[PDB]
Amino acid sequence: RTSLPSPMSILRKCIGMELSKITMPVIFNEPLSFLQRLTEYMEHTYLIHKASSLSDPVERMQCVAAFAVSAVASQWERTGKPFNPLLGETYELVRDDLGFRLISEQVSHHPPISAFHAEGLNNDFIFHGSIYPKLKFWGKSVEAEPKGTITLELLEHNEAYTWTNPTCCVHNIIVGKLWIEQYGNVEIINHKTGDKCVLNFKPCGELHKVEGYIQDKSKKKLCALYGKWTECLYSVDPATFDAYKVPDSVFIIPGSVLLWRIAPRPPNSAQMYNFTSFAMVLNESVIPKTDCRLRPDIRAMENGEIDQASEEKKRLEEKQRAARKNRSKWKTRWFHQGPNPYNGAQDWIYSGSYWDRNYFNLPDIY
Amino acid sequence: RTSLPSPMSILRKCIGMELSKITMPVIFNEPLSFLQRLTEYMEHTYLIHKASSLSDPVERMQCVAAFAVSAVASQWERTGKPFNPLLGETYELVRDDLGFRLISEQVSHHPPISAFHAEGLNNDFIFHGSIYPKLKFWGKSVEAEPKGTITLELLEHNEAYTWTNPTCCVHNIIVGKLWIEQYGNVEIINHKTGDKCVLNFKPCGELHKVEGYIQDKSKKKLCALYGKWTECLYSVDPATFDAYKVPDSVFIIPGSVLLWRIAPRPPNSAQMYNFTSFAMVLNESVIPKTDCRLRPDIRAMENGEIDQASEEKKRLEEKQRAARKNRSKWKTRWFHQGPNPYNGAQDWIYSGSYWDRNYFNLPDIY
Amino acid sequence: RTSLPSPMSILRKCIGMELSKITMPVIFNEPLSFLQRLTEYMEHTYLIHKASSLSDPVERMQCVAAFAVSAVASQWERTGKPFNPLLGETYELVRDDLGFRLISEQVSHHPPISAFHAEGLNNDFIFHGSIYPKLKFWGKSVEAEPKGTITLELLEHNEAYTWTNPTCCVHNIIVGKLWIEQYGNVEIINHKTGDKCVLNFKPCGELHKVEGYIQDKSKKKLCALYGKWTECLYSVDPATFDAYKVPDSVFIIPGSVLLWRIAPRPPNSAQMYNFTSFAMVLNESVIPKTDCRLRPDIRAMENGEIDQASEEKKRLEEKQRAARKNRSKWKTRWFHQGPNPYNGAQDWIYSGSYWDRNYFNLPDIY
Ligand SMILES: CC(C)CCC[C@@H](C)[C@H]1CC[C@H]2[C@@H]3CC=C4C[C@@H](O)CC[C@]4(C)[C@H]3CC[C@]12C
Ligand SMILES: CC(C)CCC[C@@H](C)[C@H]1CC[C@H]2[C@@H]3CC=C4C[C@@H](O)CC[C@]4(C)[C@H]3CC[C@]12C
Ligand SMILES: CC(C)CCC[C@@H](C)[C@H]1CC[C@H]2[C@@H]3CC=C4C[C@@H](O)CC[C@]4(C)[C@H]3CC[C@]12C
């Protein structure tokens, strides 16, 4: 043979031994994929159906403002990490009673970017977005900044809303009391009417308070929002609002309107990873070979067999660690790196044709 | 689904990573279970048959005193640890010529308690007890205190004897000459006649000397016992006894009686873990699935294949480490935590019905 | 049973845990056995066919001098270690056009001694020898001294040549620029005519220069050799030679004769471990079960599957580590520890009968 049928210091060989050394334990993990944890945004989809039927934009704004708060609400007492989705992992949930269907494909493992797309069962809204959790270690706590723009298209009103979820932080992680706190600044934009809803998730510095307002294009406060993201959210007149001025309730301003309050967790919550009645349904047979319900890493943990799922986590990570190396010589099956049509940021637009059962060449993640 | 089909800090997660980190090498081990090492008490069963036929209680006491010494005698030059019996492990030995049959089930792995029961082939005695070795590290040596009461029921005389084996110590273990020494205080009680036999296993401080006496209920020395537990044991008159007063023989007092002396080890001893002619028989097909002869950990080591048995030790320990966790959501098959009927201490009474071949639901240890 | 069917401190048990702790990574390795790396001596076999046809001994000496230089010439830019041959590993190469056939059996793993034997296709020469690489770590470099005597028997002239390859050194290995250098002193002896060819592989201290001379029995310089082992080798008159007097050409003395120059490496060299056009042929079905082409450790690395070959390296080393222990209760199949018939050193004489396809009881290395 003329040549070969294949091609090609100690410290340099050591920088490769350290870069390859990555693993993951399975105890801080909870029996849910991150695609399933993000699916909890649709827990209060009724606020979207309520928003698409109101003829007043500021009343639509209150519902979208309440929906954004209700989406990040179920993150209380749930100090369990979701399974980091393997490259190509997908998930779908069709709630017949709530009236929505959602797709979510793990579109990137480096960085761990997750893209999703949801649509109304009666063609009333379209909900999609992408989230990349940037984990920051600092002091005795750990932050997690959900990088990405959320998009809610109100179909029958020919409008769309965009905002950014606030930063989630896990306090006292070294040797203390784990309690989750969410803070940051959320701004919702009505791209048709020009209405902006500013929301200020206050920090422990008063613990889970959320204060904000809703204004128009001329920048005039129309409603004053207040409450706690672990309890409720109110909408009171702005004039009467300004006239009022593991750490451990809300003060109802006269003339307030209860936009939304938390649904009580089922009795099975305290001893089952503090799940909500909606979260315990995330996990028949026509599902694709990539749906995380088929992931034996998450599945084996759900049956109580701990050590069985821990090895299959190392197994599935090792296959993803090996198949990624063989591709140096990836195809996003349901999303394409397209710009967000309302704000311009590089989003992940839903390609389509997923609800057609005819598909082939889906990667073999597990 | 309403709920789930299964239920549920870093430093706290580290105390679990350290508590779970337990393993065991297989080189200090010797190809014998601890149930087999303890079976060597019956090596000199003839002293029991000799005891049940004598009409003099103090002559019966001398034999039981000699039997207790002969039981811990074979522990010389045998610096090899026996295989720690897995939970539920059993062993049985029926010597047709010696005239006894013995059962021993590993009744507890935490703490490592071993319970046994032996009976005479001609219905002349009943021998049972429980032993828990408490290992103490100190200085450049290692002790092992056999916690538990030995019980010898002389059937035809309607009497029973009870005593406690002395502490075994392994000197010079770090980087020195391993030599076994046994010291402590043993007291044998004749619960029918009130005779007490005190035995003082002297320590290296003279090396393996054993001095003692036999007295009645009125506390009067009847016989004076002396000798070495690695050699012999004599019974001389108490009056003429008091008139006489790897480290490296006995002085026969005038008027002495040789109660017992050691049997010479076979020539195959020096190059086969210093076993005795009785110990090399401990390891046909109607044996239960728990008999340690069926343990592949001990078995593979007996054939010379070292590395084969070392992995199966890790395998059998890992199965015991996994099956114990699945029971948090044990059944002693042949012993029940009953009090010793002669002294009152919490012993392990032999339940019975073992010699009936009909049995089911025996745990799958290997 | 009378006895057993098998025979037999912490710090002493630790000296065994450290002596057994040996492994090997597979990245510095290159997809070639050391038996194949040494086979590159025959890359310029034409110099041997040219030597056996010349009627002048000093012209034969120049060719053997040029052949010895050309043998260690292909070690440039090849900073990849060959696979350490397992005990009993063999290799054979029959180049029909070059006119030679060579056998090489890994005759010893401790120390790693490799023995080979080559013969001319037209019965013109016999080439054999043994090499043991003594690895020395020093400073920021690593040496490798090829211990062993090379033997070239010129058949039709009834003479034989013997010499020793120079020391190979790998500079700047810690965290620097890996570049190979060969230095030492090589002396070729014509045992029939008494001619001696001294070769001085100069060191970096001028980088790869090689200066030497050829003298007779009366110790008189007949030819003066100069050049670089990575370029060429010349033979000029000794009188006109003395009249001339990652670090980074030759000066052609008037009246010089080009004995040999390097063959240009194929274009596939730079991105395929810097192999030569001859080296890329070392790796149909009548080959014995020991030929390193059948070694899956070297084979799997040749197909590009890296991690597949890395485990099979640990596998094949573990089998060699286990089969060597079972022999304490080895047979060299093609060489016998016989003294070299020309200089007297303990060589490895080729037994014979290898080219007969009838053979049995070859060890199962993989
Ligand atoms: C302590 C370690 C080992 C495990 C716990 C880390 C967990 C609590 C971290 C890792 C990633 C984080 C999540 C990243 C993304 C979101 C989406 C956001 O809209 C709500 C918060 C939420 C859900 C974060 C909650 C906290 C989180 C789940
Ligand atoms: C050095 C380590 C790793 C291995 C050696 C430990 C061995 C020698 C220890 C561990 C448990 C100990 C045994 C525990 C129980 C008994 C029963 C008693 O009636 C005689 C002594 C005897 C038999 C002990 C002898 C010494 C012993 C076997
Ligand atoms: C850096 C480490 C991990 C791997 C690299 C070590 C390599 C370069 C070393 C190990 C053994 C050495 C070889 C030992 C034997 C010979 C035969 C001699 O006639 C030419 C040099 C040669 C071919 C040496 C070249 C350098 C060598 C191949």
Q: Where are the beta strands (DSSP E) in A22-79?
A: 29-33
> A364 to chain C, minimum CA–CA distance in Å?
19
**What is the C-alpha R_g of chain B?**
22
Domain B29-281 has CATH 2.102.10.10: no
> Tokens 């492994």 appear where?
C23
Say whether the peptide bond before residue A5 is cis (omega within 30 degrees of 0). no
Distance CA B348, CA B113 (A): 10
Token pair listed for A162: 């965009």
Whether C178 is in the pocket of ligand 3, judged by its Cβ within 6 Å, is: no
For C215, other C-beta atoms within 10 Å of its C-beta total: 18
- CB–CB contact B322 A303 (8 Å): no
Distance CA A4, CA C280 (A): 6
C19 touches chain B (CB under 8 A): no
Q: Which of B4, B9, B16 has the CB atom closest to A173's CB atom?
A: B9
Whether C72 is in the pocket of ligand 3, judged by its Cβ within 6 Å, is: yes
Q: Which of A173, A271, A303 has the CB atom closest to B10's CB atom?
A: A173
For every residue of A100-113, DSSP letters joined together read EEEEEEEEEETTEE
Asked if B339 and B347 touch (Cβ cutoff 8 Å), the reply is yes
Ligand 2, atom nearest to B178 Cα: 1
Structural domain boundaries in chain A: 29-263, 291-324
Asked if A29 and A147 touch (Cβ cutoff 8 Å), the reply is no
> Tokens 């997923």 appear where?
A354
User: Could you say which residues from 290 to 329 on chain B have a Cβ atom under 8 Å away from some Cβ of chain A?
Assistant: 322, 325, 329
**CB-based contacts of A75: which residues, under 8 Å, 6+ apart?**
A168, A180, A182
Q: Which of A27, A272, A307 has the CB atom closest to B4's CB atom?
A: A272
A8, A12, A318: best mutation site toward chain C, by most C Cβ within 10 Å?
A: A8
Search chain C and give the residue with CA nearest B308.
C322
Distance CA C167, CA C144 (A): 6
Q: CA neighbours within 13 Å on the CB side: how many for C13?
A: 13
Question: How would you classify the pairing of strands A81-83 and A29-33?
Answer: parallel
Distance CA C163, CA C65 (A): 10
**Alpha-carbon distance values, A219 to A59, A191, A242, B120 (Å):** 17, 14, 17, 101
Asked if A102 and A71 touch (Cβ cutoff 8 Å), the reply is no
**What is the C-alpha R_g of chain A?**
22
**Alpha-carbon distance values, A302 to A310, A313, B223 (Å):** 12, 13, 70
Token pair listed for C236: 């000029």
For every residue of A31-46, DSSP letters joined together read EEEHHHHHHGGGGGTH
Ligand 2, atom nearest to B165 Cα: 19
For C60, other C-beta atoms within 10 Å of its C-beta total: 24
C2, C4, C18, C19: best mutation site toward chain B, by most B Cβ within 10 Å?
A: C4
**CB-based contacts of C249: which residues, under 8 Å, 6+ apart?**
C231
Distance CA C148, CA C241 (A): 31
Residue C184's nearest CA partner among C224, C136, C237, C249 is C136
Q: Subunits with at least 3 CB pairs below 8 A relative to chain A? A: B, C
Say whether the peptide bond before residue A111 is cis (omega within 30 degrees of 0). yes
> B303 to chain C, minimum CA–CA distance in Å?
6
A281 touches chain B (CB under 8 A): yes
Whether C173 is in the pocket of ligand 3, judged by its Cβ within 6 Å, is: yes
Q: Is the dihedral of CA B248, B275, B306, A307 positive or negative?
A: negative
C-alpha of residue A82 to centroid of ligand 1, in Å: 8
Whether A263 is in the pocket of ligand 1, judged by its Cβ within 6 Å, is: no
Ligand 2, atom nearest to B38 Cα: 17
DSSP one-letter code for B281: G
A8 touches chain C (CB under 8 A): yes
Q: Is the dihedral of CA C66, C68, C71, C72 positive or negative?
A: negative
Token pair listed for A103: 């797709």
**CB-based contacts of B135: which residues, under 8 Å, 6+ apart?**
B142, B143, B144
Token pair listed for B118: 């032996």
Asked if B136 and B167 touch (Cβ cutoff 8 Å), the reply is no
Burial of B235 (0-12, 13-18, 19+ CB in 10 A): buried
Residue nearest to atom 28 of ligand 2 (CA): B81
Residue C240's nearest CA partner among C228, C223, C227 is C223
Whether A72 is in the pocket of ligand 1, judged by its Cβ within 6 Å, is: yes
The closest ligand to the CA of A173 turns out to be 1
Distance CA C166, CA C75 (A): 12
Phi, then psi, of B127 in degrees rounded to 5: -125, 120
**CB-based contacts of A258: which residues, under 8 Å, 6+ apart?**
A232, A234
Residue nearest to atom 5 of ligand 3 (CA): C81
Length of chain B: 366
> Tokens 């029921």 appear where?
B153
Residues of C in contact with A329 (CB under 8 A): 304
**CB-based contacts of B225: which residues, under 8 Å, 6+ apart?**
B62, B65, B197, B199, B210, B211, B212, B213, B214, B233, B234, B235, B259
**CB-based contacts of B95: which residues, under 8 Å, 6+ apart?**
B42, B45, B101, B281
Residue nearest to atom 23 of ligand 3 (CA): C75
Domain A29-263 has CATH 3.90.480.20: no
Ligand 1, atom nearest to A71 Cα: 19
C-alpha of residue B170 to centroid of ligand 2, in Å: 8
B307, B308, B310: best mutation site toward chain C, by most C Cβ within 10 Å?
A: B307
> Tokens 């005519």 appear where?
C193
The closest ligand to the CA of B33 turns out to be 2
**Alpha-carbon distance values, B89 to A18, B29, B42 (Å):** 44, 17, 20
PDB resolution in Å: 3.4
**CB-based contacts of A251: which residues, under 8 Å, 6+ apart?**
A244
Asked if B107 and B113 touch (Cβ cutoff 8 Å), the reply is yes
Distance CA B181, CA B76 (A): 8
Q: What is the 3-state secondary structure (H, E, C) of chain C?
A: CCCCCCCCCHHHHHHHHHHCCCCCCCCCEEEEEHHHHHHHHHHHCHHHHHHCCCCCHHHHHHHHHHHHHHHCHHHCCCCCEEECCCCCCEEEEEECCCCEEEEEEEEEECCEEEEEEEEECCCCEEEEEEEEEEEEEECCEEEEEEECCEEEEECCCCEEEEECCCEEEEECCCCCCCEEEEEEEEEEEECCCCCEEEEEECCCCCCCEEEEEEECCCCCEEEEEEEECCCEEEEECHHHHHCCCCCCCCCCCCCCEEEEECCCCCCCCCCCCCCCCCHHHCCCCCCCCCEHHHCHHHHHHHCCCHHHHHHHHHHHHHHHHHHCCHHHCCCCCCEECCECCCCCCECCEECCCCCCCCCCCCCCCC
Whether B148 is in the pocket of ligand 2, judged by its Cβ within 6 Å, is: no
Distance CA B155, CA B166 (A): 26
Token pair listed for C117: 């034997």
Burial of C190 (0-12, 13-18, 19+ CB in 10 A): buried
Q: Which of A5, A7, A10 has the CB atom closest to C173's CB atom?
A: A10
**What is the C-alpha R_g of chain C?**
22
C8 touches chain B (CB under 8 A): yes
Ligand 1, atom nearest to A29 Cα: 4
Distance CA A262, CA A75 (A): 12
Distance CA A242, CA C3 (A): 96
Question: How would you classify the pairing of strands B232-236 and B112-120?
Answer: unpaired
DSSP one-letter code for B27: S
The closest ligand to the CA of B143 turns out to be 2
Whether C207 is in the pocket of ligand 3, judged by its Cβ within 6 Å, is: no
Token pair listed for C243: 């009249």
Distance CA B67, CA B188 (A): 11
> Tokens 């009467």 appear where?
A240
